[PDB]
Motif scaffolding. Structure first.
Motif, PDB file in Angstrom:
ATOM      1  N   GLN A   1      -7.836 -25.396  27.986  1.00  0.00           N
ATOM      2  CA  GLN A   1      -6.671 -26.093  27.279  1.00  0.00           C
ATOM      3  C   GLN A   1      -7.747 -27.502  28.878  1.00  0.00           C
ATOM      4  OE1 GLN A   1      -4.500 -29.085  25.776  1.00  0.00           O
ATOM      5  NE2 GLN A   1      -6.139 -29.776  26.642  1.00  0.00           N
ATOM      6  N   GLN A   2      -8.633 -27.484  28.755  1.00  0.00           N
ATOM      7  CA  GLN A   2      -9.578 -28.867  30.018  1.00  0.00           C
ATOM      8  C   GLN A   2      -8.646 -29.776  29.808  1.00  0.00           C
ATOM      9  OE1 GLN A   2     -13.909 -29.577  31.424  1.00  0.00           O
ATOM     10  NE2 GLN A   2     -13.976 -29.649  29.073  1.00  0.00           N
ATOM     11  N   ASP A   3      -7.893 -30.163  31.545  1.00  0.00           N
ATOM     12  CA  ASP A   3      -7.835 -31.453  31.731  1.00  0.00           C
ATOM     13  C   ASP A   3      -8.172 -31.938  32.813  1.00  0.00           C
ATOM     14  OD1 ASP A   3      -6.225 -33.618  32.102  1.00  0.00           O
ATOM     15  OD2 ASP A   3      -4.226 -32.718  32.357  1.00  0.00           O
ATOM     16  N   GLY A   4      -9.281 -32.831  32.520  1.00  0.00           N
ATOM     17  CA  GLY A   4     -10.846 -33.880  33.625  1.00  0.00           C
ATOM     18  C   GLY A   4     -11.406 -31.846  34.594  1.00  0.00           C
ATOM     19  N   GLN A   5     -11.458 -31.332  35.581  1.00  0.00           N
ATOM     20  CA  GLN A   5     -11.598 -30.511  35.809  1.00  0.00           C
ATOM     21  C   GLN A   5     -10.608 -29.180  36.106  1.00  0.00           C
ATOM     22  OE1 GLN A   5     -14.416 -30.824  37.068  1.00  0.00           O
ATOM     23  NE2 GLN A   5     -14.580 -33.006  36.719  1.00  0.00           N
ATOM     24  N   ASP A   6      -8.962 -29.358  35.464  1.00  0.00           N
ATOM     25  CA  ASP A   6      -8.673 -28.161  35.535  1.00  0.00           C
ATOM     26  C   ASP A   6      -8.475 -27.910  34.456  1.00  0.00           C
ATOM     27  OD1 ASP A   6      -5.336 -29.523  37.151  1.00  0.00           O
ATOM     28  OD2 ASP A   6      -8.062 -29.581  37.983  1.00  0.00           O
ATOM     29  N   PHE A   7      -8.826 -26.146  34.174  1.00  0.00           N
ATOM     30  CA  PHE A   7      -8.728 -25.122  33.068  1.00  0.00           C
ATOM     31  C   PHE A   7      -7.402 -24.430  33.007  1.00  0.00           C
ATOM     32  CE2 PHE A   7     -12.801 -25.537  31.545  1.00  0.00           C
ATOM     33  CZ  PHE A   7     -13.512 -26.778  32.764  1.00  0.00           C
ATOM     34  N   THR A   8      -6.340 -23.945  31.950  1.00  0.00           N
ATOM     35  CA  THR A   8      -5.780 -23.391  31.510  1.00  0.00           C
ATOM     36  C   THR A   8      -6.953 -22.460  29.943  1.00  0.00           C
ATOM     37  OG1 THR A   8      -3.939 -24.971  31.372  1.00  0.00           O
ATOM     38  CG2 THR A   8      -3.352 -22.969  30.637  1.00  0.00           C
ATOM     39  N   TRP A   9      -7.516 -21.342  30.730  1.00  0.00           N
ATOM     40  CA  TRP A   9      -7.842 -20.275  29.908  1.00  0.00           C
ATOM     41  C   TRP A   9      -6.904 -19.369  29.635  1.00  0.00           C
ATOM     42  CZ3 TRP A   9     -13.753 -21.954  30.466  1.00  0.00           C
ATOM     43  CH2 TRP A   9     -13.959 -20.470  28.809  1.00  0.00           C
ATOM     44  N   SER A  10      -6.453 -18.512  28.490  1.00  0.00           N
ATOM     45  CA  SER A  10      -5.670 -17.800  28.086  1.00  0.00           C
ATOM     46  C   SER A  10      -6.731 -17.024  26.253  1.00  0.00           C
ATOM     47  CB  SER A  10      -5.037 -18.294  26.735  1.00  0.00           C
ATOM     48  OG  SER A  10      -4.044 -18.513  27.660  1.00  0.00           O
TER      49      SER A  10
ATOM     50  N   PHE B   1      -7.146 -22.830  36.554  1.00  0.00           N
ATOM     51  CA  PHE B   1      -8.253 -23.316  37.916  1.00  0.00           C
ATOM     52  C   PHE B   1      -8.917 -24.305  38.429  1.00  0.00           C
ATOM     53  CE2 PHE B   1     -11.571 -22.485  35.294  1.00  0.00           C
ATOM     54  CZ  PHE B   1     -11.738 -22.214  33.831  1.00  0.00           C
ATOM     55  N   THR B   2      -9.185 -24.990  38.690  1.00  0.00           N
ATOM     56  CA  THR B   2     -10.290 -26.103  39.182  1.00  0.00           C
ATOM     57  C   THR B   2     -10.893 -25.860  39.355  1.00  0.00           C
ATOM     58  OG1 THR B   2      -7.619 -26.936  39.996  1.00  0.00           O
ATOM     59  CG2 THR B   2      -9.643 -28.544  40.355  1.00  0.00           C
ATOM     60  N   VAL B   3     -11.629 -26.639  38.844  1.00  0.00           N
ATOM     61  CA  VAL B   3     -13.405 -26.480  39.475  1.00  0.00           C
ATOM     62  C   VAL B   3     -13.780 -26.924  40.775  1.00  0.00           C
ATOM     63  CG1 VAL B   3     -15.744 -27.446  38.830  1.00  0.00           C
ATOM     64  CG2 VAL B   3     -14.151 -27.040  36.658  1.00  0.00           C
ATOM     65  N   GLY B   4     -14.435 -25.873  41.658  1.00  0.00           N
ATOM     66  CA  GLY B   4     -14.425 -26.438  42.799  1.00  0.00           C
ATOM     67  C   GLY B   4     -13.502 -25.535  44.089  1.00  0.00           C
ATOM     68  N   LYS B   5     -12.186 -25.307  43.230  1.00  0.00           N
ATOM     69  CA  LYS B   5     -11.593 -24.927  43.970  1.00  0.00           C
ATOM     70  C   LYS B   5     -11.422 -23.677  44.157  1.00  0.00           C
ATOM     71  N   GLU B   6     -11.136 -23.103  45.185  1.00  0.00           N
ATOM     72  CA  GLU B   6     -10.779 -20.614  44.858  1.00  0.00           C
ATOM     73  C   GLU B   6      -9.521 -20.729  44.583  1.00  0.00           C
ATOM     74  OE1 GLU B   6     -11.145 -16.731  47.101  1.00  0.00           O
ATOM     75  OE2 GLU B   6     -11.231 -18.358  48.487  1.00  0.00           O
ATOM     76  N   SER B   7      -9.473 -19.486  43.723  1.00  0.00           N
ATOM     77  CA  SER B   7      -8.444 -19.292  42.729  1.00  0.00           C
ATOM     78  C   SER B   7      -8.576 -17.794  42.466  1.00  0.00           C
ATOM     79  CB  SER B   7      -8.024 -20.107  40.931  1.00  0.00           C
ATOM     80  OG  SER B   7      -9.523 -19.990  40.349  1.00  0.00           O
ATOM     81  N   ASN B   8      -7.585 -17.038  42.191  1.00  0.00           N
ATOM     82  CA  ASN B   8      -7.183 -15.725  41.192  1.00  0.00           C
ATOM     83  C   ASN B   8      -7.354 -15.482  39.696  1.00  0.00           C
TER      84      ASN B   8
END
Length: 122
Positions: free
Chosen positions: A40-49, A59-66
């Motif tokens: 599910q892509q909402d703008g630059q935010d992703f939920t990836w299952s 995760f968000t594009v351009g922002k660090e995550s785990n």
């Protein structure tokens, strides 16, 4: 990117998993799983299952995550947009995701071994 995809083709699965360090018995059984990816892509935010058990990453594009893999391996990374691909650079690990005509294409590179997954849109 938004959608539900099912794995249909893959390149160099064995060599890649050996390089991760997984045993040949686990590689033998795991190859027979069919992986289903839901995005599910909402703008630059992703939920990836990933299902086949379930593993969800946010995760968000351009922002660090785990990012956590299906097995449980967590790692710090920043997802970048590059010409239609999502891109994850990391110590000795390059990974990209891409839509190529209603098909989720996922490439991963460790050493000189390239793993490629192609999943059909459901």
């Amino acid at each position: 990117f938004t959608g539900k995809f099912e794995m249909e083709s893959e390149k160099n699965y064995d060599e890649f998993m050996k390089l991760l360090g997984i045993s040949s018995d686990v590689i033998e059984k795991a190859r027979n799983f069919k992986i289903v990816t839901e995005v599910q892509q909402d703008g630059q935010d992703f939920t990836w299952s990933q299902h086949y058990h379930t593993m969800t990453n946010k995760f968000t594009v351009g922002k660090e995550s785990n990012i956590q893999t299906m097995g449980g391996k967590t790692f710090k990374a920043t997802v970048q947009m590059e010409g239609g691909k999502l891109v994850v650079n990391f110590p000795n690990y390059h990974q990209t995701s891409e839509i190529v005509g209603d098909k989720l294409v996922e490439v991963s590179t460790i050493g000189g071994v390239t793993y490629e997954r192609v999943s059909k849109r459901l």
